Amino acid sequence: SFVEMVDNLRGKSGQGYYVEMTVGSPPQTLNILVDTGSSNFAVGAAPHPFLHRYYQRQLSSTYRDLRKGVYVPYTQGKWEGELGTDLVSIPHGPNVTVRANIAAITESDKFFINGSNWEGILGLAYAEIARPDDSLEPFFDSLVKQTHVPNLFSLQLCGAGGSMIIGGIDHSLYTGSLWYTPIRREWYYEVIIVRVEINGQDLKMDCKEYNYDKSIVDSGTTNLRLPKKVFEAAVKSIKAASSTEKFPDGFWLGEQLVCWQAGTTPWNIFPVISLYLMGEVTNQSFRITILPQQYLRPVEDVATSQDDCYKFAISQSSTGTVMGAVIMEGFYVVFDRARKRIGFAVSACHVHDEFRTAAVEGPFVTLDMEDCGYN
Numbered sequence: 525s526f527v528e529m530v531d532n533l534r535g536k537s538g539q540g541y542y543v544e545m546t547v548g549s550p551p552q553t554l555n556i557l558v559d560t561g562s563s564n565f566a567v568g569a570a571p572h573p574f575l576h577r578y579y580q581r582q583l584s585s586t587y588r589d590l591r592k593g594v595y596v597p598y599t600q601g602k603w604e605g606e607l608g609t610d611l612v613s614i615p616h617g618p619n620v621t622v623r624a625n626i627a628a629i630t631e632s633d634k635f636f637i638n639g640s641n642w643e644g645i646l647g648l649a650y651a652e653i654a655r656p657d658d659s660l661e662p663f664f665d666s667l668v669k670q671t672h673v674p675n676l677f678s679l680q681l682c683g684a685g686g687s688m689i690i691g692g693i694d695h696s697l698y699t700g701s702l703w704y705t706p707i708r709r710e711w712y713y714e715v716i717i718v719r720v721e722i723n724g725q726d727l728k729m730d731c732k733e734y735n736y737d738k739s740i741v742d743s744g745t746t747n748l749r750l751p752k753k754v755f756e757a758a759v760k761s762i763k764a765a766s767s768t769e770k771f772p773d774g775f776w777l778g779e780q781l782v783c784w785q786a787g788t789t790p791w792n793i794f795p796v797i798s799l800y801l802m803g804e805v806t807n808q809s810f811r812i813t814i815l816p817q818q819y820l821r822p823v824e825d826v827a828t829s830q831d832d833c834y835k836f837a838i839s840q841s842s843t844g845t846v847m848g849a850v851i852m853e854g855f856y857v858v859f860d861r862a863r864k865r866i867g868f869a870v871s872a873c874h875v876h877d878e879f880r881t882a883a884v885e886g887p888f889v890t891l892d893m894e895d896c897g898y899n
């Protein structure tokens with residue numbers, strides 16, 4: 525019975541999705557960003573301009589110091605602090621309490637986000653990328669070891685809350701079939717993209733380019749991030765499709781925003797993006813189709829609530845493909861750790877106009893999918 529965990533997430537793709545958690549004895553309540561792109565559980569533990577509250581180790585009778593420091597650098601931001609353990613619970617999660625590793629953040633740089641309403645981060649990926657090293661057991665590993673919570677969780681991120689189903693799959697959160705792609709290696713949630721189409725036209729690149737470095741699923745990043753060569757081809761194709769309208773080159777860099785009179789956004793001139801993922805069966809893939817309503821991120825114009833403004837949510841990467849929050853929105857994503865696979869289905873909170881639809885479709889036949897992984 526997962527109904528208690530439905531709608532247990534708040535926040536947005538721009539500043540992160542967070543779940544409520546309690547740490548220590550007596551319980552201290554904190555809002556924690558859910559991050560499938562990392563593996564450290566860390567909380568603000570000292571005053572900071574953008575923190576409304578923080579973990580007070582001194583007030584917890586169950587806190588234990590590990591006398592070890594830690595620092596984590598991300599694509600954006602970094603923090604350092606002191607490692608320790610304490611009792612942790614998830615109010616709108618499974619009814620259980622675990623002793624988990626906790627990094628008490630004492631200094632940070634461009635990590636906390638003004639007005640985000642979260643005070644910590646829950647890294648849900650594997651120990652291989654945990655800092656300072658892989659012997660620091662991540663939270664979800666601790667959860668599975670100390671309780672009977674099954675070794676999987678699912679994320680339903682919704683655009684303009686959501687759900688994190690801890691320990692299972694809630695069939696009422698999606699429609700259609702779940703399609704699974706193998707987790708290539710247990711460090712990030714690494715996957716293999718075997719084909720990319722824009723408005724049904726193949727990008728016709730060596731599929732190794734799509735995974736150049738790696739390809740990961742990351743709820744803790746906003747954008748779809750693409751390696752240089754793929755980003756240029758994708759932007760070139762998207763510009764061509766919307767060429768009847770003018771945008772400054774800063775828009776295509778995610779710097780500048782674009783606006784239109786409310787209700788006149790020309791969605792039809794922006795193409796759909798189809799990402800084909802390696803399937804579970806020999807020579808078989810499936811595809812997920814991304815609408816422009818996902819990669820044109822709505823941004824509030826505080827000057828005049830007249831227009832509808834958007835930011836281009838596709839950016840260039842030097843560390844491989846990242847399927848960020850705008851890609852996961854509208855899909856139900858199953859992180860099936862027990863079976864080393866990630867499932868995609870159309871979400872019940874799917875983004876839809878009236879002419880096109882986000883979709884998860886298969887099967888497709890794709891030869892030599894193994895040659896698409898970077899080495």
Ligand SMILES: CCCCNC(=O)[C@H](C)C[C@H](O)[C@H](Cc1ccccc1)NC(=O)c1cc(NCCCC)nc(OC)c1
Binds near residue numbers: 538746849
């Ligand atoms: C040590 C090995 C593990 C390192 N693993 C990463 O480094 C991954 C690739 C990355 C994280 O998901 C990071 C988590 C995060 C979340 C909030 C604030 C800072 C960092 N996220 C980003 O670094 C990132 C976040 C955002 N926006 C914040 C809202 C998130 C929905 N924007 C970016 O734009 C480039 C990058």
